[PDB]
Every structure is written in C-alpha cells, then in structure tokens.
C-alpha cells in the first residue's frame, strides 16, 4: 500500500480503463527493460542528432542540487570527473559509486531499476508477510 498525500485526496476507482498513453501518474516501471538490438531506440530520444536535454546542464547561478534529474543522460565526464552523482528513487536515492563506460549515452532513469526486486522483511506485517509467503515472494 503506497503511502502518499494524494492517496487520500484521489481514488483509484478500481481497475478503471484510461485513454491510451494518458494515465495520470506516469510510473515507467519498464525503463530498465533490456533490449540489445534496440539499445539506442528504447526509452531514449528518437533522433541521434538531438541535443541533450536541458536537465543535463546548469542554467542559472545555482547553489547546488541534492540529486540530478532522471532524464539527465550519462556522459563520459560523469565517470571521468569522479564527482558525486545521485538520482532520486525509492526509497530515498541511488548514488553512482561504480562509474562504468558501458552506460555512456543512456538516461539515468533507464539505468536505475524503478521496481526493485528486493523486499524489506522489517516493515512487513504479519498478515502482509503471510500474503507474500502465499504469493511465493517470501519464504
């Protein structure tokens, strides 16, 4: 059960059908979907000639960003500079402490797994743990 302010304000109204590609809250759970032949044409800008998004650059006289935007595309300088790179994700943040050259040119949201396979055994309740065991997700 996701806990957020909008959860009380809005209502799911069951498994309602939305217009194609027009769900209100976008949750790209398929960003980390791997596809070798379609590596450059999945969750990425369609044209190779397009410039990098505005989110990859600093515009004004900034004082500092806690985390960079997900659409910011990983570049060589991200690994070469050896600086601190963080991306907001559940639960709190994901930090790039393993700079690799195999992710150059791909978006950080594509690199980061949205739906983490790991399940917390601590906050899980008795009934919820029983449900997970019945589903097979937990022993």
């Amino acid at each position: 059960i996701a806990k957020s302010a909008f959860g009380f304000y809005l209502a799911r109204r069951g498994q309602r059908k939305y217009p194609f590609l027009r769900r209100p809250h976008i949750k790209n759970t398929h960003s980390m979907n791997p596809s070798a032949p379609y590596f450059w044409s999945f969750m990425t800008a369609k044209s190779q000639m397009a410039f990098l998004p505005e989110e990859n650059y600093i515009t004004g006289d900034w004082t500092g960003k806690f985390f960079v935007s997900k659409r910011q595309v990983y570049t060589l300088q991200h690994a070469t500079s050896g600086a601190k790179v963080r991306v907001k994700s559940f639960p709190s943040i994901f930090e790039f402490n393993s700079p690799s050259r195999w992710n150059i040119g791909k978006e950080m949201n594509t690199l980061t797994k949205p739906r983490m396979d790991l399940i917390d055994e601590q906050m899980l309740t008795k009934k919820q743990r029983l449900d997970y065991v019945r589903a097979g997700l937990l022993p």
Binding site: T63, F66, V68, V85
Partner: protein, 266 residues
Amino acid sequence: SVSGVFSKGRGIGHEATTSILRYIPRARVPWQPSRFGRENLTAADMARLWSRGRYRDGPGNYNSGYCTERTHVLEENTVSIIPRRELEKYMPDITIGPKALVTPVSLMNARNGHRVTHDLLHSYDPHIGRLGKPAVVDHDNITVEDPNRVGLNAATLDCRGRIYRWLRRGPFFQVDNYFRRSVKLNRDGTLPTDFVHEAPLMRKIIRLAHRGHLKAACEEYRRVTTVPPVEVYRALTACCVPGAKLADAVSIFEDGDSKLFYVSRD
C-alpha cells in the same frame, strides 16, 4: 495561550505622518478589523514566504538549485547537497544572465505582453506587484531571487485578489501600461525625444529616407521603441512626393499625429 504565524511586523508609513494621522479614525473593515498583508511582513519572513511561492525552480523548494540549506533530511535518511563546483565537473555551465530572461519590445506582442521569461508573471501596472512601494518592473536586473516583490506568484499571502485582477486584465493591458509608464510626456512641455540610446536609429532612418529607400526606412521605423522626432516624419512624408505615395504619406501622418502626442503636427 497565544499562537502566531508571524511574531513581528512593520508598518508602512514612517514616523512623519502617522503621529498626526492617528487622531483621525479609520473605518476598517467591520468583519476583520486587524489585517496583516504581504507588504506588512518583515524582511526575512517575506523573503522566506516569497521563496515558497514557486512550485519548483525556486529557492523555497529543497532541490531547485537555489537552495541554501547544508543538508536535507529525506525519508529519515540524511543527504548532502552537491555544491556548484562539484556539479560543474560533469554538468556543462551555460549561463547568459539577466539578459537571457528579457525579450525585446517587438517580441512582446508575440509573447502576449510579456517581456520577461521569468516563471512569475510580471505586470507593468503599479497595482499587482504592489508592495509598500509601487510596482516597478526592472529589465536588466531580472533574477530568480528577485529582491523587488514585483512578480506575481500563486502561493504567497493576499494573492487571490491580485490573481483575479491579473485575470481580469483588458486587451492591450500590459502594452498600454508599458507605453504610458515609459513614454510619458515631459512636464516642461517638450516631447519625450532626444533619447541617447534611440538616437542612432533616427539618423539611420533619416539617411535611408534621404536616400529614397522608403520601404527600408519604414522597416527600420517599425523597430523604434520610443517616440521618434518630427524629423523622421517630415523625411518620410517628403519621400512620398516623387512616387505619389499619398496612401503611405497619409498613413505616416496618422501614425504621427493621432497617437504619438501629435509629433507630426508640423
């Protein structure tokens, strides 16, 4: 058991008029005798309230690039702000400054009365950005911090009425306000001419006119921001005699006299 959102406030008029004006009762609003607006806030409180107006890309938001806190607690997990120097290493620095935000007058009409790209809508009338001082909009000092409370935001105090007033603007509202607050006639009776910045354009127009390039002369005339002098109009009118362009001469005379303070009444 007294609670207050703001623990200190300041008055509007200083100690030269209120001491005498206090003897005259003021008919305050019956159902709310005590009022406390944004122009009555202290400096720090007003700054921190105006920072929170913008949804994002503003000082109030914890991660917008303009924050000042050393650390931010996120989901019971502390995080440290990456400084600008460390960001610069892998984020290329592109920055023009206040000049990028502002747009030219000729593009103001296409941008629908807005010469500023700032995310707070700037209105040139002296009533929307109404702090204690009248609302005056700067052009080369536009910044995200915006020390002068001249912009319009939809989260600060006593903003609903200003939002309604902005939405009820008439046609040519901002354009008319800009014109009437920038091209006002001088008190001494002299026309608002002899502007130092606009002077070369007049000479260029005069040269093109005397060279008989009336089309290019008008194409450069439309770029004039202030009111051109009578020399421009007399040259443009005298250009139409060889070509018998009475239509264009009449149009020039109308644009000169009917609108711009009867400059072409010569």
